[PDB]
Each structure stands twice: as C-alpha cells, then as structure tokens.
C-alpha cells in the first residue's frame, strides 16, 4: 500500500522459503549463498523441508551472546541447488529502536501476509517461554501462532525475525550484520 510494504514485498518475493520441522511450518529468511535463519524453538535437525522438498542441513548454529544468553536465532546452511540474493547490506550494524516497521509472513496457513506493526522498541531482556533471551525488539501488535519466523523490516532495513508474543505485544530477535560475516 506504501513504501514500507514495497520493501517488505521485495524481501518476501526473493529471500523467503517455507521451512517445516517436527515443531511446525515457519517463514524462513534466506540471507546469502545457502545460509538462512529460523527461530531456535523450530529445533532444526539433520533434515528440514524447504518448500515441501527434503533438504539436508549442512550446518545449524543456535546463537547466544558472549554472556551465554539465548538470542533465539538459528543460522542454517542448506544443501540447496540455488543461492539466495545477498541481502546482508540491508542488516543493521547495531542494536536500535525503529519507526514504522512491517511484519511479513508466508506459510501454507498465512500466504502473502503483511502487518504494519508501528514503532519497534529495543526491549532487550525477555523471559521467552521460560528461557532468558537478549536483543529482543517489541511492537504493540497482537501477533498469533503461525507468525514465528516472520520478517520484520523498515524501508531499506531487515531488522529481525518474529519469535513470540504475549497476546498484546509481539517480540522479534534482532538480526545484526556481524552474525553473517565470512
């Protein structure tokens, strides 16, 4: 409907796949080469389904900060025959607050879904499902089951992936450029 939704759509149309684990279907963001991200609670194993095709997992790393606190991001390298468009130049370098963000989801349950969530707070610490978690972004939208892995964007930036909600607020794990240096 406007330039926020434009940037979000450009990311969804080229840089997402539908990932299925034993714990559900998730929006999955492809970042560069065969490297993607997914919430750690997806419990990625040795094999994952990517757009309903059986795919070997070459590597999976559940990220934690240097205090050994959960960040809820798993970086996955996929045994796929095709690379993602490199979007690392759209990743923020530092922790920050944002205005006017969009949360975008694409699954069998919620295809082509876009939500204007408004202001995004650098919330920091969250007890997420009982697990102490750092680098959380918060938005005041009543997000639901099915939105985990959803991509959070502003114009020109891919800032996080949706990881939870409390019925009134939604929470995303930050994406930082430093996670994907090689």
Q: Could you describe the 3D structure shown?
A:
With 182 residues, this protein is mainly β. The protein folds into two domains: 1-15 and 85-182, no CATH class; 16-84, no CATH class. Helices cover 7% and strands 53% of the residues. It is built from one helix and twelve strands, in the order αββββββββββββ. The chain has a six-stranded antiparallel beta barrel with strand order 1-2-3-6-5-4. Strands 7-8-9-12-11-10 form a six-stranded antiparallel barrel. The protein starts with a helix and ends in an 8-residue tail after the last strand.
Beta content comes to over 45%
Integer count of domains: 2
Bin the helical content: under 10%
Q: Helices and strands: which structural class? A: mainly beta
DSSP summary: helix tally: 1
What value does the Rg take, in angstroms?
Answer: 15 Å
According to DSSP, the number of beta strands is 12
Judging from the principal axes of the Cα atoms, what is the shape? globular
Subunit structure: Interacts with host IFIH1/MDA5; this interaction inhibits host IFIH1.
Active site: 41 (for protease 3c activity), 72 (for protease 3c activity), 148 (for protease 3c activity)
Protein name: Protease 3C
Organism: Human enterovirus D68 (EV68)
């Amino acid at each position: 409907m406007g330039p926020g939704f434009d940037f979000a759509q450009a990311i969804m149309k080229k840089n997402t796949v539908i990932a299925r684990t034993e714990k559900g279907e998730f929006t999955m963001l492809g970042v560069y080469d065969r490297v993607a991200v997914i919430p750690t609670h997806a419990s990625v194993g040795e094999i994952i389904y990517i757009n309903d095709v059986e795919t070997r997992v070459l590597d999976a790393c559940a990220l934690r900060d240097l205090t050994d606190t959960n960040l809820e991001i798993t970086i996955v390298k996929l045994d796929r025959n095709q690379k993602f468009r490199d979007i690392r130049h759209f990743l923020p370098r530092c922790e920050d607050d944002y205005n006017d963000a969009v949360l975008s989801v694409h699954t069998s349950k919620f295809p082509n879904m876009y939500i204007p969530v408004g202001q995004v707070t650098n919330y920091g610490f969250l007890n997420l499902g009982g697990t102490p978690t750092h680098r959380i972004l918060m938005y005041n939208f009543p997000t639901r089951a099915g939105q985990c892995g959803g991509v959070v964007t502003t114009t020109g930036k891919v800032i996080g992936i949706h990881v939870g909600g409390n019925g009134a607020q939604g929470f995303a794990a930050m994406l930082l450029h430093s996670y994907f240096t090689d």
